[PDB]
Amino acid sequence: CPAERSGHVAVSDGRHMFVWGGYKSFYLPREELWIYNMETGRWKKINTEGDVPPSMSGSCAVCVDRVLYLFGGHHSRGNTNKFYMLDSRRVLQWERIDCQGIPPSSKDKLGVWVYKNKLIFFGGYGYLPKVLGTFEFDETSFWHPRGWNDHVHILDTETFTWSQPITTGKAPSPRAAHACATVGNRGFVFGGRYRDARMNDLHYLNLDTWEWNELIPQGICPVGRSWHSLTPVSSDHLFLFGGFTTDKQPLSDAWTYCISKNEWIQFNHPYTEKPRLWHTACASDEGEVIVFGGCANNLLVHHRAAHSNEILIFSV
Numbered sequence: 001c002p003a004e005r006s007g008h009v010a011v012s013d014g015r016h017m018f019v020w021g022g023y024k025s026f027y028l029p030r031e032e033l034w035i036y037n038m039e040t041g042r043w044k045k046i047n048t049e050g051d052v053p054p055s056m057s058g059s060c061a062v063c064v065d066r067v068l069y070l071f072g073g074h075h076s077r078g079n080t081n082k083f084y085m086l087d088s089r090r091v092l093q094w095e096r097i098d099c100q101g102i103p104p105s106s107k108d109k110l111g112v113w114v115y116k117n118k119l120i121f122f123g124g125y126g127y128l129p130k131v132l133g134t135f136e137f138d139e140t141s142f143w144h145p146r147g148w149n150d151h152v153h154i155l156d157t158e159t160f161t162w163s164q165p166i167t168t169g170k171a172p173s174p175r176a177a178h179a180c181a182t183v184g185n186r187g188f189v190f191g192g193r194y195r196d197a198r199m200n201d202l203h204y205l206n207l208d209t210w211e212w213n214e215l216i217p218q219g220i221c222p223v224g225r226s227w228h229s230l231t232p233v234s235s236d237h238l239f240l241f242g243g244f245t246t247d248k249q250p251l252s253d254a255w256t257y258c259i260s261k262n263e264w265i266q267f268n269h270p271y272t273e274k275p276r277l278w279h280t281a282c283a284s285d286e287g288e289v290i291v292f293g294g295c296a297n298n299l300l301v302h303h304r305a306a307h308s309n310e311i312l313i314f315s316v
């Protein structure tokens with residue numbers, strides 16, 4: 001089984017989940033790639049070669065037709081804006097892509113939407129970028145300063161060219177440790193950290209018109225948080241789990257956001273005593289959400305961090 005970790009990446013094709021990176025109480029080996037079979041519940045470790053990225057926490061990854069794409073993260077010498085690809089369809093080779101155009105600023109803890117040939121990245125925490133959007137310094141980083149951004153960048157996989165769309169509507173504030181989910185042409189984003197708050201707002205970017213929309217669901221809504229997961233489980237539902245509140249409470253609540261009804265529904269599950277923050281979540285083809293890793297308590301107290309290697313399965 002893989003070692004415990006937080007800030008790792010996990011991506012899937014609905015059957016196999018590929019886990020990489022992260023750190024524990026030390027970064028996990030850069031050349032290792034763990035594969036979890038969602039049907040049998042078994043793990044397999046493989047060592048990769050090629051342009052192996054440095055070991056990082058907070059990288060942003062996606063799996064499209066079993067091609068893994070990785071952007072950003074934080075390694076032993078800070079944030080990066082490098083882009084890597086790993087074709088998981090023989091020893092697997094990582095490929096660092098020298099992209100065309102102006103890339104995003106070096107950052108981690110951001111989100112991505114997949115839409116046709118585009119990988120659309122949003123937000124994050126990193127160095128000052130010049131770029132369309134706004135960047136807000138984190139005053140605590142001055143005493144290389146860093147901050148939050150609300151930037152939207154497109155990486156066109158047809159030519160590996162970076163660009164920025166011109167967006168309309170009220171964008172969400174700059175943020176990092178938010179969660180992104182794509183359904184149809186809507187790039188949803190929920191919560192995240194900004195200034196002294198871990199927020200409770202829900203928005204979607206229309207990936208055809210580049211219009212931002214804020215969603216105000218009716219009734220009870222989940223508490224604001226960062227370091228939570230948000231996973232599409234059907235053409236009409238997003239599954240929310242875990243995170244960390246403004247007042248530093250680890251979370252074990254789970255909810256479904258019904259897109260058509262614009263309504264949250266609290267989901268009952270047997271993991272109430274297993275809160276997680278900075279875990280990953282991947283949907284399987286059988287409707288389940290597979291949660292891996294993350295921390296059970298406040299990971300900011302590094303000497304007491306309860307990093308996990310547990311698989312938590314939600315039958316959504």
Ligand SMILES: O=C(O)Cc1ccoc1
Pocket residue numbers: 109125148175176177192193198226227244
């Ligand atoms: O504190 C958090 O929730 C994580 C974070 C730190 C800076 O930006 C996001």
